[PDB]
Amino acid sequence: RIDVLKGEKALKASGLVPEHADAFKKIARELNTYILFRPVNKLATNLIKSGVATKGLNVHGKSSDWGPVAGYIPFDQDLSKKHGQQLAVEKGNLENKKSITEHEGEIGKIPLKLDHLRIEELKENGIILKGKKEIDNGKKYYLLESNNQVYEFRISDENNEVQYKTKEGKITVLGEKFNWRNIEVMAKNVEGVLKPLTADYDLFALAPSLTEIKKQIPQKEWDKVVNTPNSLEKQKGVTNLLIKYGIERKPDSTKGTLSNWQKQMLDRLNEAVKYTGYTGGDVVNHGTEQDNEEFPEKDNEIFIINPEGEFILTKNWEMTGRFIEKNITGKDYLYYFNRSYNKIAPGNKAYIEWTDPITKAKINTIPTSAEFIKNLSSIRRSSSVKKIAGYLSDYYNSANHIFSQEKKRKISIFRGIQAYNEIENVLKSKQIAPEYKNYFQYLKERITNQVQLLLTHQKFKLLYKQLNFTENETDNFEVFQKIID
Amino acid sequence: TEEQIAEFKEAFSLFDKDGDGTITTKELGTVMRSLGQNPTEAELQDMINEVDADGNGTIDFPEFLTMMARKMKDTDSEEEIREAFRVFDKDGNGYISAAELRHVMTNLGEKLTDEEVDEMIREADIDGDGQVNYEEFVQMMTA
Numbered sequence: 105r106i107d108v109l110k111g112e113k114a115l116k117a118s119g120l121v122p123e124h125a126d127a128f129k130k131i132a133r134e135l136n137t138y139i140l141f142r143p144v145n146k147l148a149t150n151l152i153k154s155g156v157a158t159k160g161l162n163v164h165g166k167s168s169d170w171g172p173v174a175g176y177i178p179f180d181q182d183l184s185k186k187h188g189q190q191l192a193v194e195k196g197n198l199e200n201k202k203s204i205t206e207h208e209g210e211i212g213k214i215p216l217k218l219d220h221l222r223i224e225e226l227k228e229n230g231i232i233l234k235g236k237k238e239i240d241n242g243k244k245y246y247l248l249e250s251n252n253q254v255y256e257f258r259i260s261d262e263n264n265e266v267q268y269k270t271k272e273g274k275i276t277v278l279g280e281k282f283n284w285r286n287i288e289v290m291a292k293n294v295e296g297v298l299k300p301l302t303a304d305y306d307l308f309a310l311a312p313s314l315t316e317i318k319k320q321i322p323q324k325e326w327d328k329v330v331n332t333p334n335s336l337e338k339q340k341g342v343t344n345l346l347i348k349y350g351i352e353r354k355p356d357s358t359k360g361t362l363s364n365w366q367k368q369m370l371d372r373l374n375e376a377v378k379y380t381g382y383t384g385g386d387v388v389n390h391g392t393e394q395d396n397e398e399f400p401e402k403d404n405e406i407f408i409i410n411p412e413g414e415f416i417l418t419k420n421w422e423m424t425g426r427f428i429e430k431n432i433t434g435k436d437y438l439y440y441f442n443r444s445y446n447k448i449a450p451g452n453k454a455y456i457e458w459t460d461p462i463t464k465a466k467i468n469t470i471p472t473s474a475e476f477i478k479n480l481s482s483i484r485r486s487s488s489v490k491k492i493a494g495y496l497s498d499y500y501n502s503a504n505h506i507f508s509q510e511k512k513r514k515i516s517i518f519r520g521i522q523a524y525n526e527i528e529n530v531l532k533s534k535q536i537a538p539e540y541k542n543y544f545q546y547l548k549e550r551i552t553n554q555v556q557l558l559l560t561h562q563k564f565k566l567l568y569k570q571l572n573f574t575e576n577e578t579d580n581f582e583v584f585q586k587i588i589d
Numbered sequence: 590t591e592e593q594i595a596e597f598k599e600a601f602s603l604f605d606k607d608g609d610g611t612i613t614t615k616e617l618g619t620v621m622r623s624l625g626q627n628p629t630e631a632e633l634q635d636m637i638n639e640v641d642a643d644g645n646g647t648i649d650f651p652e653f654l655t656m657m658a659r660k661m662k663d664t665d666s667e668e669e670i671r672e673a674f675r676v677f678d679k680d681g682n683g684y685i686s687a688a689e690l691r692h693v694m695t696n697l698g699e700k701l702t703d704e705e706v707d708e709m710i711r712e713a714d715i716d717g718d719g720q721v722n723y724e725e726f727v728q729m730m731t732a
């Protein structure tokens with residue numbers, strides 16, 4: 105049992121338009137595939153529903169979740185939800201600035217217009233209240249109050265334009281002060297007219313069933329593999345089709361990095377909402393969060409729609425991990441987690457943890473030569489026996505496939521103790537680098553657990569005495585053979 | 590990447606009884622393998638003649654570093670392979686078992702007998718523990 109939210113209560117916490125999430129129930133069932141979304145600006149839901157255009161990757165400025173511009177993407181990023189955070193606002197503004205120029209004609213900016221109906225919605229949401237009247241240079245204005253401390257807003261009675269200015273004595277995050285001026289919002293070009301943008305739906309992940317992936321493979325490419333006499337090549341061949349038609353992703357000009365089944369899913373999803381009436385265009389504009397390797401986000405709550413059309417919403421990252429583990433990654437579904445997890449993302453330096461089974465096994469398996477080297481390439485950051493990088497290359501020798509398990513275990517348990525030897529006498533020399541001594545005291549431990557394992561699979565230091573290091577050929581391998589009995 | 594170059598260059602000195610980072614084609618293959626590849630005698634040739642048309646047989650970093658430059662192109666699918674391994678390992682123990690292989694297989698169409706399955710595991714198995722770890726899965730997919 106895991107404390108997740110369900111149905112209506114979960115849909116409410118998602119930020120998605122109800123009609124839309126319902127339309128999405130279909131696709132989840134039809135294709136049998138889990139659809140996982142990231143939080144959606146709760147103040148953007150009504151805008152989206154009323155048909156406001158959503159935003160693509162060509163606009164990275166954040167949306168607002170407060171004040172008269174809640175839901176839209178303010179040009180001035182200090183009006184966005186990143187309000188008050190100087191570094192974020194600056195990155196935000198630099199982003200809007202690039203969008204306006206690097207995409208001149210496609211992305212622009214226009215004065216925010218709060219219409220009669222939106223004002224009401226903002227009142228119900230307790231975001232702003234229509235205040236007292238005011239006249240300026242022969243123009244009628246009504247103030248718009250907000251519990252905000254730095255700014256003050258008012259709206260024009262003639263054309264409904266909203267303006268803002270800094271407060272007496274108050275300063276901006278960027279250290280500015282200024283009087284009355286329009287609030288500009290990011291817009292996209294539609295038939296020669298600039299239309300305001302709002303948040304869109306961001307897929308956190310997509311987990312399709314393996315059978316659903318099969319349909320992605322040409323039924324005659326698969327056949328040529330299903331009928332391969334040799335097994336070892338048949339397997340590699342089956343795996344390569346999985347990689348090819350389900351795992352592999354590629355960068356797209358505007359949808360970021362995604363696979364091909366993902367592109368179809370994208371399309372079905374956007375079509376699904378159009379059938380329900382959404383008139384703004386696409387609502388899902390790019391690949392999933394799992395390919396956001398440079399600037400990974402980590403949300404507490406993920407909104408999930410399972411293949412049975414049900415609504416789930418996890419409470420915290422750990423819970424999102426349990427769910428995916430118990431119902432997807434361990435239940436015959438295609439899935440892959442962000443490559444940046446368990447690392448320091450380059451972009452934002454984020455360090456998001458995620459359970460990786462391959463590592464759980466690390467402690468009990470011995471490293472391949474490569475891994476041995478690449479760990480002398482990363483170890484040689486904070487700062488000649490090639491025999492070890494050879495033995496390890498010997499341990500994982502494909503030739504082993506013509507022998508019997510009994511045989512395999514024997515020669516491996518040997519090739520291991522071999523590597524556990526060279527490493528031993530290296531540590532017997534000079535602790536060259538204080539921290540290198542660890543890599544070895546460590547390998548030794550792995551090598552140990554690995555050998556010790558193969559042995560119990562049949563019948564360590566106890567046997568590391570009665571053995572040859574002395575002269576160096578197949579003479580040592582001799583005593584060994586007999587010892588294991 | 591920096592490490593990419595760091596890696597190659599790192600091993601380049603593990604065996605070079607020359608000291609000037611200018612080995613021979615006698616060990617060029619010895620290097621590409623202790624690093625993670627398995628080039629054929631034919632490949633260790635045509636290339637050691639094109640880029641290294643020098644006429645000495647001495648391989649230095651500038652040469653070696655540029656050669657890898659190309660091979661490490663399509664082969665880099667290592668990322669997908671590793672993600673693939675995770676697809677098979679349904680119980681997340683870090684190893685691919687026969688049972689798990691059946692699942693992945695039947696769900697993709699090709700129905701197999703407990704006989705055949707255990708034959709596949711045992712072929713990919715290298716240390717004879719009856720299961721396949723990522724290291725092995727890599728071999729079976731590259732080698």
Ligand SMILES: Nc1ncnc2c1ncn2[C@@H]1O[C@H](COP(=O)(O)CP(=O)(O)OP(=O)(O)O)[C@@H](O)[C@H]1O
Nearest residue numbers: 145160161163164165166167303304306393396399
């Ligand atoms: N500074 C930056 N540089 C490059 N890419 C960035 C970026 N900031 C964000 N991204 C990209 O943008 C994606 C993050 O979602 P975003 O497009 O920025 C809007 P959102 O998630 O809908 O939030 P919002 O409601 O605040 O607008 C990631 O997949 C990432 O690739």
Ligand SMILES: [Ca+2]
Nearest residue numbers: 678684685686
């Ligand atoms: Ca397993």
Ligand SMILES: [Ca+2]
Nearest residue numbers: 715716718720
């Ligand atoms: Ca094994």
Ligand SMILES: [Yb+3]
Nearest residue numbers: 159304305306
């Ligand atoms: Yb987005």
